[PDB]
Design a protein around this ligand. Structure first.
Ligand SMILES: Nc1nc2c(ncn2[C@@H]2O[C@H](COP(=O)(O)OP(=O)(O)O)[C@@H](O)[C@H]2O)c(=O)[nH]1
Ligand SMILES: CNc1nc(Nc2cn(C(C)(C)C#N)nc2C)ncc1C(F)(F)F
Length: 1084
């Protein structure tokens, strides 16, 4: 609670007047380039008044530094002002724009003023004007004194700061007597000490260093209170934490404010510094003459002329104007400091640039185009750009008064009539009349074509004789705070007219039209006509209604594909928008219209109501708009300036609205305090936990990845459109995780629909064999070690005899365990085979157990109730060196009597007669291996371990047909792990290859044509099968490995994946011929 008395006293002195020498003769050069921060203490007469140390900032006056200065005129500062008196009131006039800049930039700062050079001060001349001076700031004194011999009343700054504790208070608080805790002064001291060791040519530090040292010094600085502390320390004037996300300076921290200021000379003397945000951005070097450039069309009628009457050119105005107006994609440029001259041809050229030959002290901006049509488009674009600029960065100007210079009779001077009356004179009726002679008349289309909307293409022109809507409130739709969208016809159509309200400034209509009439796309609603007589808009009436009351009402039509269409077409719209420097800031689920609820359409969403879409270059925006609940975080704290990534957060919120199927918006339509509790961050639940939805675990991974606070950690709109354009994201259903230090190499589902999924997981990591039992809809991992050796294979048979079901296992020790699927305690162990257990598999129901010794082990389905038995004879169809681990079933006409398989490195088959009807060895390189699985759709696709190839032997000719290599197919994904540890088959579409390298391979069936390849989610694929789920078929389990900590995910894949990767690819192929057919018309 120590009183920390420190505040800046930036002595802002116009050039030449001696701004430096005054403080030189107060405390104790030639041209002080940039800011020069000295230091200065105070020991007042009353010793109880603590040290009032003041970080003096000694600014400069050369216009380049005028332009680079106005970002360091912060609050908590007692300014000054200096002006010579030998030049009399002229210096007062010259300092008047500077005082205006002061009162514009800083409002809570007193402004003393002082003269200089009392040796030649003719105060009787300018005294009257100086008294008449006191929009200005609160001038509090006038002490015109000498410069070198300080004999007048000086040191009054102390008596005007220490007594200004409450007379200069930051919102009634204490400035010079702020009882600040010890933590803040601790941080200040440690930074002031560490200022040395950090390099001197570019002193910067990382926030991680600050945290590490604060922990090393036990500063007791909490991470949730650290940014407020560093912000106060910044505003004190010892370091500069530029936390502006539009500048990306949120990480790098600065320790020497003295250094940041004296870089203007370093950069005008003619890395990673390349962000000079204060093509090229060196406005110091620009010449400041009136160049030798003459208009081609030099008359009083052939050229339009606009004007702008402004009190004071704001510090850093012309810089922003040129940096904006060097967008040249709508050109021999000759831009000096102020007046850019965008020449194209003798037909169209916009010559912006000031003019002060007005016989008056005011400052005049002017625009000039030759009065053909292209000139009118140019003028009606530059007016929009200048008005956006002046409405975003410099709100104080709107004082501003327009001026349109028309000419009644050619070959004479032009009169001056302003737009606040021309608006009415052109809204009542066209053909502006000449009061002197009524026979003389001029058109309002070659005087100011930004007032009749003639600066737009000729196709979008109203046809009011065919707009038959009555204003009757029966036809009503949304009311977006500016208009009210009715339902109407237009020459025969369904069109949603948007009549504007009683009084709306035409700037709004142009704010909407400049985005609706330039960039076309099949995801952005397309304007049909826009008049001016009632100031209306006509937009293509979206049939199926806005999204909000399709969420609240029609929850049945909302499938799990449509939820990825109305979240992909919107991402398309956002990508196109942000690709042309427009930002939207309004993407809420009341503003996504629909056109068709049939899933596989082509145009399903189209954004609308572009009420607040402003232009946003790399500089950014400074205002704060939107709507509570759907606003970006940094929009709330309106002080910071943001850019085109305060929109992707709105998209994340829309996505959380969609995934919840309208639970957040309906539970928050009661109290907007609930919807604004998370307006910054930190109050969003995990969706599946509460609202009862179904999982979607490649969206939940994105929904947090585009929701973070740090405006650089969020994706760019392209990157958040190239994650949804992948059929790997629509076709999962779940993703479970298993504990640490456990593997899985044996799986059996339960199609009997006890809980519709009661997946067992045989494992053998330890010596004893474990037997997990996972439930799907609840995720209960109730493992139980009930075996002595590894559990190689499991199998299930739901006995129809007495409606039973008894899961059966197998052991590496060669034992046949049996457990009741319903009775948790029945260990009806059967007769152990003569060797180990290799595989098992299920009319004629019988367990076709496979042993390591190469002998077929068969049982009886009815022999389950027994306790130890060898039901049917063993068929030793192999040797000790033949591992009989192959078993499978048949699919061709479901003829299970054609049950295939293969004994070791050899293929065989049999029937219910149990005789080998065919035995074909596979001795035909990799042939020194064994066999894993066979599958029969039309032939036998046979896999084998450590093989980048899978063979194809036919069941009718018994010969090789083709060799479908795997590593060859994977040769363009990135000595590879291109093995095939598993091989599952769909019903009648395509193969499903599972590669131990961590890649699903959706090989198709026709000849060899690949369809896609899945990657970057696992590290291996242990065992794959196909089961049922929730009374419905079509799921495809996959057991991914993570290997060193072993993690065995258990994914769930919909089996409609092939026709997905096809359908969605055809869809995206369709609408990208439209996205170029529509767009190419806008250039034409
Ligand atoms: N003749 C005269 N010259 C002065 C007086 N006070 C200051 N100067 C000159 O003004 C110069 C300082 O200008 P300066 O304040 O640095 O200009 P700035 O950098 O644009 O602010 C010094 O070189 C002095 O020679 C004065 O009372 N009489
Ligand atoms: C946002 N306003 C618009 N709304 C629509 N579609 C729409 C149709 N209905 C109903 C249910 C009445 C029907 N049929 N409701 C809505 C929101 N189309 C166009 C717009 C537009 F022009 F304002 F963008």
């Amino acid at each position: 609670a120590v009183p920390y008395n420190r505040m800046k006293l930036m002595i802002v002195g116009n050039t030449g007047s001696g701004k430096t020498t005054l403080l030189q003769q107060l405390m104790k050069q030639s041209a002080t380039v940039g800011i020069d921060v000295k230091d200065w203490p105070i020991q007042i007469r009353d010793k109880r008044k603590r040290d009032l140390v003041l970080n003096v900032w000694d600014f400069a006056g050369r216009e380049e530094f005028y332009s680079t200065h106005p970002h360091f005129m912060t609050q908590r500062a007692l300014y000054l002002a200096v002006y010579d008196l030998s030049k009399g009131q002229a210096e007062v006039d010259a300092m008047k724009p500077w005082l205006f800049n002061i009162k514009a930039r800083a409002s809570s700062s007193p402004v003393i003023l002082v003269g200089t050079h009392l040796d030649v001060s003719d105060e009787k001349q300018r005294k009257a004007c100086m008294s008449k001076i006191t929009g200005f700031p609160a001038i509090r004194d006038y002490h015109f004194v000498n410069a070198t011999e300080e004999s007048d009343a000086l040191a009054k700054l102390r008596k005007t700061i220490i007594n200004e504790s409450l007379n200069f208070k930051i919102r009634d608080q204490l400035v010079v007597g702020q009882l600040i805790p010890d933590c803040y002064v601790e941080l200040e001291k440690i930074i002031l000490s560490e200022r040395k060791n950090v390099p001197i040519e570019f002193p910067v530090i990382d926030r991680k260093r600050l945290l590490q040292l604060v922990r090393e010094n036990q500063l007791q600085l909490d991470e949730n209170e650290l940014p407020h502390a560093v912000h106060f320390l910044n505003e004190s004037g010892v370091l500069l934490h530029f936390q502006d996300p539009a500048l990306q300076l949120s990480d790098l921290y600065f320790v020497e404010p003295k250094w940041l200021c004296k870089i203007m000379a370093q950069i005008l003397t003619v890395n990673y510094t390349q962000y000079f945000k204060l093509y090229l951005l060196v406005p110091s070097s620009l010449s400041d003459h009136r160049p030798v450039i003459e208009l081609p069309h030099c008359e009083n009628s052939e050229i339009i002329i606009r004007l702008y009457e402004m009190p004071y050119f704001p510090m850093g105005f012309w810089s922003r104007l040129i940096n904006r107006l060097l967008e040249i994609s709508p050109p021999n440029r000759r831009y000096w400091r102020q007046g850019i001259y965008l020449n194209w041809s003798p037909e169209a050229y916009c010559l912006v640039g000031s003019e002060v030959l007005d016989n008056h002290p005011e400052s005049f901006l002017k625009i000039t185009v030759p009065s053909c049509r292209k000139g009118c488009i140019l003028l009606g674009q530059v007016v929009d750009h200048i008005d956006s600029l002046m409405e975003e960065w410099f709100p104080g100007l709107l004082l501003l008064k327009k001026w349109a210079l028309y000419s009644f009779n050619d070959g004479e001077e032009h009169q001056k009539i302003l737009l606040d009356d021309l608006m009415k004179k052109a809204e009542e009726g066209d053909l502006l009349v000449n009061p002197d002679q009524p026979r003389l008349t001029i058109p309002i289309s070659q005087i100011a074509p930004d007032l009749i909307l003639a600066d737009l293409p000729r196709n979008i022109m109203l046809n009011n004789d065919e707009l038959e809507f009555e204003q009757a409130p029966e036809f009503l739709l949304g009311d977006g705070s500016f208009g009210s969208v009715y339902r109407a016809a237009y020459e025969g159509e369904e069109v949603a007219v948007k009549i504007f309200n009683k009084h709306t400034s035409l700037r709004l209509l142009r704010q909407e039209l400049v985005v609706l009439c330039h960039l076309h796309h099949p995801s952005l609603i397309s304007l049909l006509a826009a008049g001016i007589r009632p100031r209306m808009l006509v937009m293509e009436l979206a049939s199926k209604g806005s999204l909000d009351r399709l969420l609240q009402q029609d929850k049945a039509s909302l499938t799990r594909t449509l939820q990825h269409r109305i979240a992909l077409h919107v991402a398309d719209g956002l990508r196109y928008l942000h690709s042309a420097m427009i930002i939207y800031r309004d993407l809420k689920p009341h503003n996504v219209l629909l056109f068709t609820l049939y899933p596989n359409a082509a145009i399903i969403a189209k954004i609308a109501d572009y009420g607040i879409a402003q232009y946003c270059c790399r500089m950014g925006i400074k205002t704060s708009e939107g709507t509570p609940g759907f606003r970006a975080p940094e929009v709330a704290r309106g002080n910071v300036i943001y850019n085109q990534q305060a929109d992707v957060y709105s998209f994340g919120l829309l996505l959380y609205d969609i995934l919840t199927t309208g639970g957040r918006i309906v539970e928050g339509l009661k109290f907007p305090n609930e919807f604004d509790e998370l307006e910054i961050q930190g109050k969003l639940p995990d969706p599946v936990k509460e609202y009862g939805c179904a999982p979607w675990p490649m969206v939940e991974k994105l929904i947090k990845q585009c929701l973070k606070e740090n405006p650089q950690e969020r994706p760019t709109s392209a990157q958040v459109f190239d994650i949804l354009n992948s059929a790997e994201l629509v076709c999962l259903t779940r993703r479970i995780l298993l504990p640490k230090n456990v593997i899985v190499e044996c799986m059996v589902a339960t199609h009997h629909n006890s809980r519709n999924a009661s997946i067992w997981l045989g494992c053998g990591h330890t010596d004893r064999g474990q037997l997990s039992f996972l439930d799907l809809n609840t995720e209960g991992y109730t493992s139980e070690e009930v075996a002595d050796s590894r559990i190689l294979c499991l199998a299930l048979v739901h006995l129809p005899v007495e409606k039973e079901s008894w899961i059966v296992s197998g052991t590496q020790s060669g034992t046949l365990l049996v457990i009741n699927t319903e009775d948790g305690k029945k260990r009806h162990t059967l007769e152990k085979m003569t060797d180990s257990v290799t595989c098992l598999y299920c009319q004629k129901n019988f367990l076709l157990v496979g042993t390591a010794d190469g002998k077929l082990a068969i049982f009886e389905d009815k022999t389950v109730k027994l306790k130890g038995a060898a039901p049917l004879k063993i068929l030793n169809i192999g040797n000790v060196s033949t591992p009989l681990m192959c078993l499978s079933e048949s699919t061709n006409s479901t003829e299970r009597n054609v049950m295939w398989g293969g004994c070791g490195t050899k293929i065989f088959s049999f029937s219910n007669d149990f005789t080998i009807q065919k035995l074909i060895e596979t001795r035909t390189a990799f042939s020194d291996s064994n066999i894993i699985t066979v599958v029969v759709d039309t032939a036998l696709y046979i896999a084998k371990q450590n093989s980048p190839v899978v063979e194809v032997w036919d069941k009718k000719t018994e010969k090789l047909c083709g060799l479908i290599d795997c590593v060859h197919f994977l040769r363009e994904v990135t000595s590879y792990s291109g093995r095939v540890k598993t091989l599952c088959l769909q019903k009648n579409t395509a193969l499903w290859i599972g590669t131990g390298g961590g890649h699903i391979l959706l090989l198709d069936l026709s000849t060899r044509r690949l369809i896609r390849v899945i990657y970057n989610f696992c590290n291996s694929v242990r065992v794959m099968m196909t089961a049922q789920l929730g009374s419905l078929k079509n799921v495809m389990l996959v057991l991914g490995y993570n290997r060193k900590e072993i993690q065995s995910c258990l994914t769930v894949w919909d089996i409609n994946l092939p026709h997905e990767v096809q359908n969605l690819e055809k869809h995206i192929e369709v609408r990208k011929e439209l996205a170029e057919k529509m767009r190419r018309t806008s250039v034409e």
